[PDB]
């Protein structure tokens, strides 16, 4: 029942932490509520694609859903399903829906693989207490290398039909005096070229991403987690969800963990104790565990900052209708490669990802996922009645985000004589999706709810390592920052505490 170190979750913060702990000789147990995705399903594949969604696509839902922005073309493939331990979870709060991965590797299993370093000037603005030289000289480079970030071949990108959708938006943005930038990725671009050449099994070129990629994507299970297990000091137990956390009579930590099967049936409740406890359950998971512990009195010394400072990384989705002479293509790589960088740290800052659409036929639609600078923050409040942390965030709090996104795309529409699509997110004439989030950030902010390295305030040997540490915004796709920060944190923690 005892293990020196326990890491809750297997996402970015968790993976980095477990690898370094293992390398330092600390026997570590990782607890993951989702599945280890390595068994072929009904179609001979581990994951289901976006055009053939089944129970594997969702975390305990009774019906599949179309990827945001593609309901008009993909609802036709939606089917009723048995609640199952699927890979993608849509967590619905009062006025916000947060998408998170569930499985060994966490969000790395379902994300777009976009590996982007935040602008240094912005990093220094959001985390002034952190030494930025150390982050850019050592931690970002280390994260880049271990994550296996790579770059797309420009010649191939320019010629391939699979990225015509990206080229169309580049041309359109150019007329408004806006340039584009290549987005590094963990998806093997060399493999992607071979897919287009019909030399290897297609994944990104076979409408796969949001429910996992059967090939090509260097998710954490192949990188950090593989290395962690390789140390001989790390083990991973799946379908194990931590419910409570308390401090033992001697300073260690005890956890109640529920083991379930893939159908969600409770198989057993175990008691696991440790000397060092690392939380890597994500922005939602780690914050909920802490607000629960504080409010139920199992960790009575947690401060008032626990639960505060949450932000959706200013996530806003919108789309533009192209002229008939600017078709985006029926064949679109599921992995984005280009983005529009209009981020100058001001309130009008927008870094938008040119997103592909899975329809498989010509729709003339250009889809974009904008990351904005919105000061609004939400707070996770514990509800003792349902034993769930509720996110206090209202839709109108995304107004500044919508405004920033709209001002940028209005410029592109004006320069091209194009208009927005208003029917992609429902039948209510909404050109901007403002109640979804792929990048949850905050809840246990670094330096507020914890010290500058993630040590939870009020406790010893208790650490938070994931996206809950970030103060609601990074101005870019978040995983590289979470990874780099985790490298910085665990290295210091092992040196001084272990
Ligand atoms: C569709 C989609 C697209 C995205 N695209 C990108 C992109 O291209 N680039 C980018 O930078 N970011 C992207 N992201 C966001 C990125 O995936 C997340 O920011 C990142 O995965 C967060 O890492 P984390 O370590 O905080 O937590 P997560 O990766 O979320 O991992 C948390 C893990 O903890 C497990 N866990 C939860 N609670 C418990 C519990 N109580 N007990 C046990 N285990 C638990 C979860 O099941 C999970 O496996 C996207 C996310 C989604 C949903």
From Swiss-Prot:
Main location: secreted
Annotated consequence of substituting residue 439 to D/E: Mutants do not catalyze oxidation (>100000-fold reduced), but do catalyze isomerization, 10000 times slower than wild type
Catalytic activity, EC: 1.1.3.6, 5.3.3.1
UniProt pathway: Steroid metabolism; cholesterol degradation
Location(s) in or outside the cell: Secreted
Protein keywords: Cholesterol metabolism, FAD, Flavoprotein, Isomerase, Lipid metabolism, Oxidoreductase, Secreted, Signal, Steroid metabolism, Sterol metabolism
Co-factor requirement: FAD
PTM comment: Predicted to be exported by the Tat system. The position of the signal peptide cleavage has been experimentally proven.
Active-site residues, record numbering mapped to chain: 353, 439
Reaction(s) catalysed by this chain's protein: cholesterol + O2 = cholest-5-en-3-one + H2O2; cholest-5-en-3-one = cholest-4-en-3-one
Residues that bind FAD: 12-13, 32, 107, 111-112, 114, 242, 467, 479
Matching SUPFAM superfamilies: FAD-linked reductases, C-terminal domain, FAD/NAD(P)-binding domain
Biological role: Bifunctional enzyme that catalyzes the oxidation and isomerization of cholesterol to cholestenone (cholest-4-en-3-one), an initial step in the cholesterol degradation process. The cholesterol degradation pathway allows the bacterium to utilize cholesterol as its sole source of carbon and energy.
Complex formation: Monomer.
UniProt-listed PANTHER family: CHOLESTEROL OXIDASE, FAD-DEPENDENT OXIDOREDUCTASE 2 FAD BINDING DOMAIN-CONTAINING PROTEIN
Family: Belongs to the GMC oxidoreductase family.
Name of the protein: Cholesterol oxidase
The species this protein was found in: Streptomyces sp. (strain SA-COO)
Gene: choA
